[PDB]
């Protein structure tokens, strides 16, 4: 038998230095994990031990931290570059600067190929961009050689901003004919390596004829065989077995996010490129693995910028920006109102003649909330001031929610008002009037909602069997603060940016902020 | 004797090419009046009849229509220029485009002096802009020397974007000094040119001993002895007499605004510089004086940049705004929104502690509102756009109303509902509620303000007794659409911006727009 170990990453999401546990910042760092200092040790050493290994990236490794604020993509090629990453396919947040954005740093500087075989070009950027990403390349290893197809997700232009002049395929239906072309080239290893989730990678494998093995992402989903190492809880065993339509037990891969794990698959092949076994575990990126010295050196060289970056001016506010939690937690609060304003325009999206915006509506827990900004520093406004408001280092995702789960939250909201708890939600794009003599669990007494599909952006009554897009952080996707019936009944779930990021970009292209508190939550 | 002919302009606002009669775009050319052609005519045949004369402008060439917008002074410095202005005093619009755009173009490219004795700057600003205004200018004229002491509006920071590093000192102590030293140097003809207001101009003439005349502007004020030959109606007659502190008779002059009038005195001088007698009347500049051929060709040739500048694309909108009188004459319509929030955003001023904007509130009535914009031009927002919602060429002025003024605004408003009349109020910083059940006069049910006096905006309840800041059309101030008591009750009034320019600025700032229907304006 022929074996390869396939290595891989996904959903990294700027995660350059070490991080927390919870993939925050590092403050402890002697628990501190992940982090490509760290990453390099571990590759380096397996690379020194096994001689056919191939380290993939499944997309996503941009957004997340101040790193890609700053860089744009350059920290992205150049560490990349340096952990000699064989190959990546493009993630949906790749787009979150435009194709300008991709291109530039990222297809122009990365070493190693960079995959998708479901985007098409039209116009004049289809001659700027051909050759640029590549629908797979074949790689030798060995003596023997790979085929690795890339796909990304066909929810790409409601996830990031691809702009109107590339076209996002449905998977199955691209890949299939590089699959079948492949073997007519001889090639009989082939591995599928996109960013699509975890549903759509078991469906690739499933129905797309010639595929080996399955490397994913976008879901950052956790998959382990055994007892876990840290706080994930898996999703099923790792590798995922699926008996694809010829047969063939097909196995497909996710290693979580952020940096913390390196996925590991050890495949046997036959002779004829079919896997005879395929066994691994991601492996926990902790202490007891050192950072790499050059690595981490030059980590520590590139952070100067950034700590330059985190004291600049990035707009101003002529308003106190009220993130107190004596408001927040209570009653609206002009931060609550910026944040969501915020959220809302990060998530404008190209529509076509349906919608004026696919979303429209925004929540934010009272307890995300964490430091006011006093504008009484000639109204200054920096990436510090922001952290300081919005300090665990999460995003802000988009849900399809049922108005019935909605209006739950809106319960839980104040089932138990005045008592200073974090569930107390500020609002985008959303009217609710609350009546606190009311039992808990009946306490909303109107709940109104802006429209989407409308060419002029109006308030109506939330329906209860409709299903509303709503951005939120994902510590409420999650189920946060005892929103449990957000997680529980949630129908779709993509995670969006930066928190900080949102806001430091909203803020900059409005200059000067001024929110008020306008009658968004009201009391009877 | 000698005599001196005066003649002089004011608050012009960028009527470089002849205006309808009430100085909106020329339609019916061969009625049409004022612009620089016409202007150049009259200056010149007066010229030529009277050996001593000087040529004055009194402020607020700046801001008015789309010349300003595009040429941004340099259109006022080469007219003025080719004119041959002797002298002219800095007004509030002056300062529209900051400090930087005062310097250039005006103040470096104007060949006649450019005067204001009551502006002081401090820091590095001190150093760049020293003599390039200057406190007065002795000129030569015949034989003689006249003296032209400069001032402008100590409310200039109110009333438009002068910086923090310029103070604007009150005019009668900033004057007297700078009087008091001209006649150490033998300069006995003393005129006060200058841009505060007729109220302020008749108290300048009253207590700065040596003052011979003031020529003023700022509150368009029309002066006329006899029959009037328009339209304007006079505030008094011209020159208007004030009564000196030291007993002499010193006349007070203006001429309205607009181009549209060339003020013209004639002043008789004994040899210690006392008036003996002044007499005159301004000239309306209507069709029966030709346009100058060659100015006219010039402005000819400006034209092209703005009609090239008309169809730009200005910004984006991804709603549609719908200025239709369906909507803005019946309820809260997202047009009328859009424009509120650009007047209110046009008037955020440099604040001090006390407040965190000047300027909260904004009314503007649906008749004003004249073309919906649909948003499937791929979006695009042009100037042409705009002039079709705002075809009339008005301004976005501030007043100071008592609560019992604008609560009967209100009632006025829907007073007589339902007939799609033009008064129905479209609102930014108010929340009014009404009850069509009720009597006319008593339909407004509930009308909350956002506060100004706090740190943090919010929506309080109306006072009757308080006095609010509002920014609103001109056409309301002066009483149109039935809003005589606005008219008739207002404690104070500055003409401001010119609509159209408001809500292209806003529209460029903002780059996409997405302006919603939100309860501003609800029915019981
Ligand atoms: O610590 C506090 O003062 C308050 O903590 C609140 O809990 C939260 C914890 C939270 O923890 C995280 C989090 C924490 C550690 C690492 C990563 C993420 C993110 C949140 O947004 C978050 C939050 O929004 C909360 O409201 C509780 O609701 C509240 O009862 C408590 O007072
Ligand atoms: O012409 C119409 O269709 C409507 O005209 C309305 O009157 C207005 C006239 C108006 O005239 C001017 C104006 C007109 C000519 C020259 C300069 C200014 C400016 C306005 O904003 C303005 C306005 O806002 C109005 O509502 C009346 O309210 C309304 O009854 C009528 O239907
Ligand atoms: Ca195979
Ligand atoms: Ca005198
Ligand atoms: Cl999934
Ligand atoms: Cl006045
Ligand atoms: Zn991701
Ligand atoms: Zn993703
Ligand atoms: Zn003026
Ligand atoms: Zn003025």
Redesign the interface.
Same mark, same amino acid.
């Given at each position: 038998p022929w074996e390869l170990t396939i290595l891989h990453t996904n959903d990294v999401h700027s995660r350059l230095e070490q991080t927390s546990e919870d993939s925050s910042k590092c403050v402890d760092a002697s628990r501190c994990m992940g982090g490509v200092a760290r990453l390099f040790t571990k590759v380096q050493q397996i690379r020194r031990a096994e001689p056919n290994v191939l380290l993939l990236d499944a997309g996503d490794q941009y957004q997340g931290t101040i790193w890609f604020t700053v860089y744009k993509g350059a920290e992205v090629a150049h560490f990349m570059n340096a952990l000699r990453y064989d190959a990546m396919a493009l993630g949906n947040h790749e787009f979150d600067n435009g194709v300008e954005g991709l291109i530039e740093p990222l297809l122009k500087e990365a070493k190693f190929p960079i995959l998708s075989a479901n985007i098409s070009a039209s116009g004049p950027l289809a001659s700027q961009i051909s050759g640029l990403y590549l629908p797979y390349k074949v790689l030798p290893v060995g003596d023997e050689v790979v085929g690795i197809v890339g796909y990304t997700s066909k929810e790409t232009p409601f996830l990031s901003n691809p702009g109107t002049n590339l076209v996002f395929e449905d998977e199955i239906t691209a890949l299939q004919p590089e699959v079948d072309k492949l073997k007519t080239l001889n090639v009989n290893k082939i591995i599928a390596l996109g960013h699509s989730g975890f549903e759509m990678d078991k469906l690739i494998a499933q129905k797309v004829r010639g595929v080996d093995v399955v490397v994913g992402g976008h879901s950052n989903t956790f998959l382990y065989t055994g007892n876990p190492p840290s706080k994930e809880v898996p999703a099923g065993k790792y590798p995922f077995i699926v008996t694809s339509d010829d047969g063939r037990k097909v196995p497909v891969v996710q290693a979580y996010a952020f940096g913390k794990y390196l996925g590991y698959l050890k495949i046997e092949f036959d002779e004829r490129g079919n896997v005879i076994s395929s066994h691994g575990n991601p492996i926990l990126l902790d202490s007891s693995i050192p950072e790499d010295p050059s690595i981490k050196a030059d980590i520590n060289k590139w952070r100067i910028k950034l700590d330059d970056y985190s004291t600049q001016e990035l707009g101003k506010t002529?308003?106190?920006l009220?993130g107190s939690s004596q408001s927040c937690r209570f009653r609206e609060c002009?931060m609550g109102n910026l944040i969501c304003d915020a959220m809302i325009n990060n998530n404008?999206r190209h529509?076509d #003649?349906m919608f004026?915006?696919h979303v429209s509506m925004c929540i934010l827990n009272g307890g995300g909330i964490r430091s006011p900004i006093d #504008?009484?520093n000639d109204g200054t406004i920096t990436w510090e001031n922001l952290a300081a408001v919005l300090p665990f280092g999460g995003t802000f995702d988009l849900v399809q929610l049922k108005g019935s789960t909605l209006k739950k939250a809106f319960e839980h909201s104040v089932h138990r008002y005045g008592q200073s708890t974090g569930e107390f939600l500020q609002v985008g794009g959303i009217?609710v009037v609350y009546d606190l003599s009311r039992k808990p669990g009946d306490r909303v007494v109107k709940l109104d909602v802006?429209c989407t599909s409308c060419?002029? &952006?109006?308030?109506d009554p939330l329906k209860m069997d409709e299903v509303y897009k709503v951005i939120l952080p994902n510590f409420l996707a999650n189920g946060g603060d005892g929103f449990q019936m957000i997680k529980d009944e949630l129908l779709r779930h993509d995670s969006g940016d930066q928190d900080i990021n949102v806001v430091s970009t909203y803020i900059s292209?409005m200059?000067?902020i001024? &929110?008020?508190? #306008?009658?968004r939550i009201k009391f009877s």
């Open positions: 002529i308003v106190y009220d002009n404008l529509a #003649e004026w915006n #504008e009484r009217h802006l060419r002029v &952006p109006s308030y292209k200059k000067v001024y &929110p008020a508190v #306008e009658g």
